[PDB]
Design a protein around this ligand. Structure first.
Ligand code: CLA
Ligand code: CLA
Ligand code: CLA
Ligand code: CLA
Ligand code: CLA
Ligand code: CLA
Ligand SMILES: CCCCCCCCCCCCCCCCCC(=O)OC[C@H](CO[C@@H]1O[C@H](CO)[C@H](O)[C@H](O)[C@H]1O)OC(=O)CCCCCCCCCCCCCCCCC
Ligand code: KC2
Ligand SMILES: CC1=C(C#C/C(C)=C/C=C/C(C)=C/C=C/C=C(C)/C=C/C=C(\C)C#CC2=C(C)C[C@@H](O)CC2(C)C)C(C)(C)C[C@H](O)C1
Ligand SMILES: CC1=C(C#C/C(C)=C/C=C/C(C)=C/C=C/C=C(C)/C=C/C=C(\C)C#CC2=C(C)C[C@@H](O)CC2(C)C)C(C)(C)C[C@H](O)C1
Ligand SMILES: CC1=C(C#C/C(C)=C/C=C/C(C)=C/C=C/C=C(C)/C=C/C=C(C)/C=C/C2=C(C)CCCC2(C)C)C(C)(C)C[C@H](O)C1
Lengths: 174, 178, 181, 154
């Protein structure tokens, strides 16, 4: 009846072990306040956006698309944001992500009703998880990599705020 | 038989530990002359306004809306410098929130006429964070403790802004004795 | 060994000019019959026991740090930014201005808030049957059956002695201007 | 018999209502708990409210950047107000109310954006600590702790 991750603390009652990545880690009792379905949807959304942002920071350090260097110049990481607000790219990005997030809102409220798993958009066009066990293995890997990429992208953007190098440039220059 | 907060006084009647934050602290006998439902509703309302007010007095120094009219770090200057039509809109909106949120029962003779109406229970739970039974009493205790601390703090900040003519955080950083 | 009735338990008083109160149960480690002001009659004993243990462990770490930093042992490169002197107060101020002690404050507060606050609240509320000072931390495996005492009593006694030692050392550093040893 | 501030109209001799509805437990995201008609929380519950807030936030994005954008010879864009959009067939009213009439950002000098904070309407954040410390400051920084320390050291 005790938390596995923090052995001197009780097992949270909203945690059960069914969800991928459940090690009984909720010491401050956030699952006692919010719904666990809302919390899992928020965790998956933060993690997926952070994986995309981490991979984006790495690849934009590595290379650039044709023509972006003329419009942007020698501006990198969050420094491009304002420039790409003056250009039309991020308005298009926000428009289509808002269009997707309208149906995301409907899906989240459907999950809060209780007919749909949090973060289950049934988007598997390559049919990777045929048998359920590999599905469990990808679920655990997805939640672990999402949390890891949350921490990683936080470190990357705050290291950019400190030195203005970039996640690979800071590695390549102390 | 004695009050727990004030051990040299007898326990005030109608106070039996049922409400949150009840330590038997009523030396002037307000609960012996007025009903506890109105007193609790008033205490929660003053406390919630002071929670928002203390958070405003701290936040407005660090964060401002764009524009010249919202650039006063000291809140008593921001009361005057803000556009007047906006504050009159704020007054009218607070009046409407009072009018509909209490369901047209606004006075000392018609609020709590419905037996289901609970002190401080306006039905306000936008994200439904109260859907858990054993958290509830601790939640009301935390809410009233935050409200009481915010009342005392906001009183202290307003009158210290009156003494010092300084916004609170930079008054703590640029302190000048009286 | 627990030595109930010799070092702890009912009937033991190390300062017999102040009589042992009836309030002390004898279950708590370090109960040696010293409560002249009768605080045990009205305070919650678990909370103040955990507070005594945590203050004691903080004072042990403070004594060890003060002695190794006033004698002259330093990490590589640690002398440069924090000054090549030995005075603990100036070491505090230089390491604050460097930003090291803010980083220490952030992580110690994160540890305090994340598991310490829930442990104290659930321990006091009666939801885990957790003992005071029990954070389940035994990496090297040194107490298994000797945990009853010869670990608890010696830790609380050294904690109190470390509190007195650190207080003495600090006020000597204040009055003399030179660190110990 | 009649406690002060009791709030019961029968206790004060005030005209009562008699009809007191029971309080249901159903909750709406941006609404209020209370008695409603049958069918109300099922058509206009949390799902509907969140969907309409999402749709309103989506439709805000073209509305915030409202204007006639016209390409020039060099491929650049010139944004000009809908107030100059003229119509052929409503008599002497060539200028007509438009979407910018309902959302007049430029009339107030408000640089609207699709997330409603603009470049010329950015939230202003400034550090109140003035780049000094909590204690042991020599300069234009005299904190409360420094005042305490000087009060003991005099
Ligand atoms: C929002 C990002 C962005 C921006 C600002 C531009 C901007 C530009 N691109 Mg470009 N491009 C982009 C994304 C972008 N592109 C992507 C994702 C691809 C697919 C790989 C391309 C592929 C592309 C090609 C193939 C060419 C451009 C070219 C150009 C330039 C036109 C002159 C212009 C500056 C042209 C040019 O002359 O650039 C060198 C050109 O030939 N672009
Ligand atoms: C660590 C990466 C990772 C992993 C293991 C998973 C795993 C999973 N996702 Mg998922 N996802 C991810 C990242 C990841 N995701 C990101 C970043 C997004 C945002 C675009 C999504 C968006 C998403 C949606 C919308 C849905 C899933 C679903 C699923 C599940 C179905 C199996 C599947 O398609 O996975 C196969 C995944 C892989 C084989 C990972 C390969 C990684 C590539 C090769 C790296 C490419 C890097 C590139 C340079 C950038 C499974 C648990 C579905 C679900 O839960 O319901 C069935 C579903 O509806 N995911
Ligand atoms: C007691 C509540 C209270 C009051 C009377 C004010 C009053 C004021 N604020 Mg303010 N503020 C408050 C709380 C409050 N604040 C809190 C809690 C925050 C933190 C989010 C802020 C953050 C804030 C900023 C950042 C700025 C102001 C500013 C101002 C001034 C101009 C009005 C304006 O633009 O509002 C702006 C108001 C907000 C940005 C947030 C208000 C949120 C309130 C608390 C509503 C939430 C509760 C609401 C009633 C719904 C509950 C309903 C329920 C009971 C049924 C004015 C003096 C501006 C100014 O002059 O700068 C010095 C400005 O730039 N405020
Ligand atoms: C009936 C509809 C209506 C209409 C037509 C207007 C029209 C106007 N208002 Mg107004 N207002 C309304 C409702 C309305 N308001 C309501 C319901 C409130 C809440 C009390 C306010 C509060 C308000 C304030 C405080 C101010 C105005 C101002 C203005 C003028 C400029 C607004 C502008 O361009 O800024 C557009 C800019 C924005 C929309 C950015 C706002 C940023 C967000 C919303 C801050 C977050 C605050 C938070 C949500 C508050 C929660 C409390 C609430 C739930 C009770 C304009 C005449 C300003 C003025 O007179 O300046 C000359 C001014 O200072 N209004
Ligand atoms: C956890 C504590 C800790 C540890 C293990 C180290 C370990 C190290 N530090 Mg270091 N350091 C610390 C805390 C610590 N530091 C703190 C708190 C500061 C802030 C003042 C610094 C500031 C610092 C600087 C400025 C430098 C180091 C350097 C070094 C390396 C020198 C190794 C060498 O050549 O031996 C030398 C052994 C002797 C001279 C002894 C004879 C070594 C890895 C140096 C280095 O090259 O970093 C990679 C270096 O230039 N440290
Ligand atoms: C006198 C030292 C001392 C002693 C005897 C104990 C004893 C105990 N602790 Mg404890 N503790 C201490 C210090 C001590 N603690 C300090 C300083 C901290 C803060 C970091 C903690 C934090 C702590 C936690 C978080 C937990 C315990 C727990 C326990 C219990 C079981 C673990 C055990 O047997 O550890 C005894 C093992 C040792 C003392 C190892 C020896 C380490 C050597 C002495 C280090 C020497 C370094 C250096 C030379 C110091 C001198 C410097 C000087 C020369 C300048 C037991 C009652 C666990 C428990 O179940 O509590 C009930 C638990 O969860 N303790
Ligand atoms: C001075 C500067 C301005 C600052 C003040 C800002 C104003 C803030 C906005 C106003 C918000 C305040 C609400 C107004 C008080 C209403 C109180 C009230 O309803 O009490 C409620 C009282 C209670 O009345 C009691 O009711 C009982 C019910 O059984 C019994 O009948 C009792 O006999 C009766 O006394 O009466 C109502 O029930 C009437 C409800 C009417 C509510 C809607 C009012 C419509 C608004 C009028 C606008 C029409 C436009 C003008 C016409 C042209
Ligand atoms: C085309 C029509 C239409 C639009 C575009 C629209 C948009 C939005 C938005 C957009 C940002 C929000 C945020 C919002 C929210 C709420 N609407 Mg909705 N709404 C529309 C229709 C109706 C009708 C007919 C009713 C209704 C209601 C409520 C309630 C109930 C609160 C409660 O029940 O406590 C809440 C919270 C019911 C009601 O009570 O209205 C007083 C009701 O009867 N709505 N609504
Ligand atoms: C699922 C869906 C599709 C999908 C698609 C998706 C997009 C597939 C891709 C998923 C990708 C985006 C996973 C990315 C993970 C990021 C990792 C965890 C993090 C590194 C951060 C840490 C280590 C760090 C950092 C560090 C610090 C902080 C700062 C730096 O100085 C240094 C350093 C870099 C070391 C596919 C096509 C697969 C098919 C499927 O049918 C349907
Ligand atoms: C109900 C719930 C809602 C929630 C909500 C609301 C928004 C909750 C958030 C609330 C905020 C408003 C609580 C504010 C507390 C303010 C006080 C405690 C600060 C006091 C400082 C004082 C004591 C001190 C002072 C001091 C003074 C004296 C002297 C000075 O020199 C220094 C100093 C300043 C330090 C949501 C929206 C989530 C939906 C959900 O479904 C239901
Ligand atoms: C775009 C843009 C901008 C921006 C921006 C962006 C992109 C901002 C991004 C911010 C992010 C991603 C922050 C992440 C913070 C993570 C933290 C603090 C993790 C702490 C972990 C802890 C304490 C512990 C972890 C742990 C450890 C060690 C191990 C055990 C587990 C645990 C206890 C959890 C601006 C603002 C510059 C403006 C600009 O004009 C436009």
């Amino acid at each position: 009846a005790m938390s596995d991750s923090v052995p001197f603390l009780k097992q949270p009652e909203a945690l059960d072990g069914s969800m991928a990545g459940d090690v009984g880690f909720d010491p401050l009792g956030f699952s006692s306040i919010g719904d666990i379905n809302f919390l899992r949807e928020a965790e998956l959304k933060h993690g997926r956006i952070a994986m995309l942002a981490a991979a984006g920071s790495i690849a934009q350090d590595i290379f650039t698309f044709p023509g972006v260097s003329k419009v942007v110049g020698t501006a990198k990481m969050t420094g491009v944001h304002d420039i790409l607000v003056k250009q039309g790219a991020m308005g298009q990005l926000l428009l289509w992500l808002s269009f997707l997030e309208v149906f995301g809102t409907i899906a989240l409220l459907e999950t809060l009703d209780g007919k749909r798993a949090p973060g289950d958009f049934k988007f598997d066009p390559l049919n990777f998880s045929k048998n359920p066990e590999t599905f469990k293995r990808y679920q655990l890997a997805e939640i672990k990599n999402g949390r890891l990429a949350m921490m990683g992208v936080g470190g990357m953007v705050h290291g950019y705020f400190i030195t203005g190098k970039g996640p690979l440039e800071l590695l390549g220059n102390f | 038989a004695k009050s727990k907060a004030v051990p040299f006084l007898s326990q005030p009647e109608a106070l039996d530990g049922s409400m949150a934050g009840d330590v038997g602290f009523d030396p002037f006998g307000f609960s012996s002359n007025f009903d506890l439902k109105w007193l609790r509703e008033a205490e929660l309302k003053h406390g919630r306004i002071c929670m928002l007010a203390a958070t405003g007095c701290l936040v407005q120094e660090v964060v401002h809306l764009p524009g010249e009219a919202f650039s006063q770090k000291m809140a008593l200057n921001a009361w005057a410098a803000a556009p007047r039509g906006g504050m009159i809109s704020i007054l009218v909106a607070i009046g409407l929130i009072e009018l509909i949120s209490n369901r047209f029962a606004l006075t000392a003779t018609d609020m709590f006429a419905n037996p289901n109406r609970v002190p401080g229970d306006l039905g306000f739970d936008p994200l439904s964070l109260g859907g858990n039974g054993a958290n509830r009493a601790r939640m009301e205790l935390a809410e009233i403790t935050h409200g009481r601390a915010a009342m005392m703090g906001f009183s202290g900040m307003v009158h210290q802004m009156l003494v010092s003519k300084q916004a609170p955080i930079e008054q703590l950083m640029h302190f000048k004795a009286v | 060994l627990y030595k109930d009735g010799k070092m702890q338990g009912k009937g033991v008083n190390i300062i017999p000019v102040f009589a042992r109160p009836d309030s002390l149960d004898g279950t708590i480690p370090g109960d040696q019959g010293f409560d002249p002001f009768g605080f045990s009659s009205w305070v919650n004993m678990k909370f103040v026991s955990e507070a005594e243990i945590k203050h004691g462990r903080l004072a042990m770490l403070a004594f060890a740090g003060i002695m190794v930093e006033s004698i002259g042992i330093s990490f590589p490169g640690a002398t440069s930014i924090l000054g090549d002197s030995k005075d603990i107060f100036e070491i505090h101020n230089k390491a604050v201005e460097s930003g090291a002690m803010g980083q220490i404050l952030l992580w110690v507060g994160f540890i305090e808030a994340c598991v310490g606050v829930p442990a104290m609240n659930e321990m006091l509320s009666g939801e885990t049957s957790r003992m005071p000072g029990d954070f389940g931390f035994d990496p090297l495996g040194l107490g298994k059956g000797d945990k009853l005492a010869r670990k608890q009593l010696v830790e609380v006694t050294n904690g109190r002695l470390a509190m007195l030692a650190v207080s003495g050392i600090v006020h000597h550093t204040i009055i003399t201007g030179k660190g110990p040893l | 018999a009649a406690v002060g501030f009791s709030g019961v109209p029968s206790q004060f001799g005030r005209p009562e209502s008699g009809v007191y509805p029971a309080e249901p437990s159903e909750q709406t995201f941006l609404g209020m708990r209370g008695p409603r008609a049958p069918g109300h929380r099922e058509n206009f519950g949390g799902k509907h409210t969140a969907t309409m807030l999402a749709i309103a936030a989506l439709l805000w994005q073209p509305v915030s950047e409202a204007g006639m954008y016209r390409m020039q010879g060099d491929g650049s864009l010139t944004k000009t107000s809908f107030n100059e959009f003229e119509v052929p067939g409503f008599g002497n009213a060539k200028k007509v109310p438009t979407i910018e009439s309902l959302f007049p950002f430029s009339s107030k000098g408000f640089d609207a954006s699709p997330v409603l904070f603009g470049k010329n309407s950015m939230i202003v954040v400034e550090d109140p600590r003035d780049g000094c410390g909590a204690y042991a400051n020599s300069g234009s920084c005299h904190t409360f702790l420094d005042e305490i320390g000087d009060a003991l050291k005099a």
